[PDB]
Amino acid sequence: DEPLIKKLKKPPTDEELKETIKKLLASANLEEVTMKQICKKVYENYPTYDLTERKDFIKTTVKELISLEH
């Protein structure tokens, strides 16, 4: 053990979270995407994170883009 340290571990600001999703819908039909797919992909980019509150936002970011921007 020596090189293993890990010092960076913070949640991505909304600018980052939204960016991740903006990439998901940008690769799929909004009316054909569901909140379930957003959480799956989103986590893919946010694996080492405890997205709990900001998570409810992600799913809501697409669900609102499909109802107010299908």
CA distances from 32 to 5, 24, 67 (A): 42, 12, 12
- Across 48-61, b (16+ Cβ under 10 Å) vs e yields ebebeebbeebbeb
What technique determined this structure?
A: NMR
The three-point CA angle 32-33-34 to 5° equals 125
How many CA atoms are closer than 13 Å to the CA of 39, on its beta-carbon side?
14
Helix and strand element counts for the chain (H, E): 3, 0
Domains for the chain: give ranges and CATH numbers.
1-70 (1.10.10.60)
Amino acid (one-letter) located at 10:
K
